[PDB]
Design an enzyme around this catalytic site. Structure first.
Site, PDB file in Angstrom:
ATOM      1  N   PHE A   9       0.810  -1.228   0.000  1.00 48.24           N
ATOM      2  CA  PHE A   9       0.000   0.000   0.000  1.00 48.24           C
ATOM      3  C   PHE A   9       0.843   1.278   0.000  1.00 48.24           C
ATOM      4  O   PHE A   9       1.854   1.403   0.688  1.00 48.24           O
ATOM      5  CB  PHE A   9      -0.958  -0.001   1.193  1.00 48.24           C
ATOM      6  CG  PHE A   9      -2.021  -1.097   1.103  1.00 48.24           C
ATOM      7  CD1 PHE A   9      -1.775  -2.341   1.671  1.00 48.24           C
ATOM      8  CD2 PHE A   9      -3.251  -0.820   0.518  1.00 48.24           C
ATOM      9  CE1 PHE A   9      -2.779  -3.303   1.698  1.00 48.24           C
ATOM     10  CE2 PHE A   9      -4.253  -1.784   0.530  1.00 48.24           C
ATOM     11  CZ  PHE A   9      -4.013  -3.016   1.126  1.00 48.24           C
ATOM     12  N   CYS A  10       0.447   2.124  -0.945  1.00 48.05           N
ATOM     13  CA  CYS A  10       0.911   3.506  -1.132  1.00 48.05           C
ATOM     14  C   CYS A  10      -0.272   4.326  -1.654  1.00 48.05           C
ATOM     15  O   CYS A  10      -1.318   3.755  -1.957  1.00 48.05           O
ATOM     16  CB  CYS A  10       2.121   3.600  -2.065  1.00 48.05           C
ATOM     17  SG  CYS A  10       1.833   3.264  -3.840  1.00 48.05           S
ATOM     18  N   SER A  11      -0.090   5.634  -1.811  1.00 54.53           N
ATOM     19  CA  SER A  11      -1.178   6.556  -2.170  1.00 54.53           C
ATOM     20  C   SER A  11      -1.925   6.177  -3.450  1.00 54.53           C
ATOM     21  O   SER A  11      -3.153   6.213  -3.507  1.00 54.53           O
ATOM     22  CB  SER A  11      -0.627   7.974  -2.335  1.00 54.53           C
ATOM     23  OG  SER A  11       0.152   8.362  -1.199  1.00 54.53           O
ATOM     24  N   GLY A  13      -0.717   3.307  -5.730  1.00 55.62           N
ATOM     25  CA  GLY A  13      -0.526   1.885  -6.051  1.00 55.62           C
ATOM     26  C   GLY A  13       0.428   1.581  -7.208  1.00 55.62           C
ATOM     27  O   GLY A  13       0.718   0.411  -7.453  1.00 55.62           O
ATOM     28  N   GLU A  41      -4.104   3.103  -0.702  1.00 61.72           N
ATOM     29  CA  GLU A  41      -4.318   3.143   0.752  1.00 61.72           C
ATOM     30  C   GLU A  41      -5.783   3.102   1.189  1.00 61.72           C
ATOM     31  O   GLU A  41      -6.112   2.544   2.235  1.00 61.72           O
ATOM     32  CB  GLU A  41      -3.595   4.363   1.327  1.00 61.72           C
ATOM     33  CG  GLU A  41      -4.261   5.735   1.188  1.00 61.72           C
ATOM     34  CD  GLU A  41      -4.434   6.319  -0.215  1.00 61.72           C
ATOM     35  OE1 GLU A  41      -5.276   5.793  -0.974  1.00 61.72           O
ATOM     36  OE2 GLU A  41      -3.830   7.394  -0.420  1.00 61.72           O
TER      37      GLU A  41
END
Length: 106
Positions: A9-11, A13, A41
């Site tokens: 997960f990141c802002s 993807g 996220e």
């Protein structure tokens, strides 16, 4: 077939994709039966529910307390800044597997 879920997960993807790709390629090479996928996220609740470990981008590391809040029963760890900058798939894969084991055992 026994497969473990490693969700990243990141802002958005998308930048994590290359790390995922490398982690997958080394998982194939070293016959590690795991599903490694990247998501934004927003889906941390919904999809993290079926994760065996949740891995976070260092950019959203400040959200570890909040995602920990969301998923209090699931091991949620941040990817090391240097490993991410170096894009070392095996290092991160080992850390992910290690976290699964520091939940299941140890």
């Amino acid at each position: 077939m026994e497969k473990k879920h490693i969700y990243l997960f990141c802002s958005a993807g998308m930048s994590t994709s290359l790390l995922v790709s490398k982690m997958r390629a080394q998982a194939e090479k070293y016959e590690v039966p795991v599903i490694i996928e990247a998501f934004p996220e927003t889906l941390a609740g919904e999809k993290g529910q079926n994760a065996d470990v949740v891995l976070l981008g260092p950019q959203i590391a400040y959200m570890l307390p909040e995602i920990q809040r969301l998923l209090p029963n699931k091991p949620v760890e941040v990817i090391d800044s240097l490993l991410y900058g170096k894009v070392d798939g095996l290092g991160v894969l080992k850390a992910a597997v290690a976290a699964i084991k520091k939940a299941a055992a140890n």
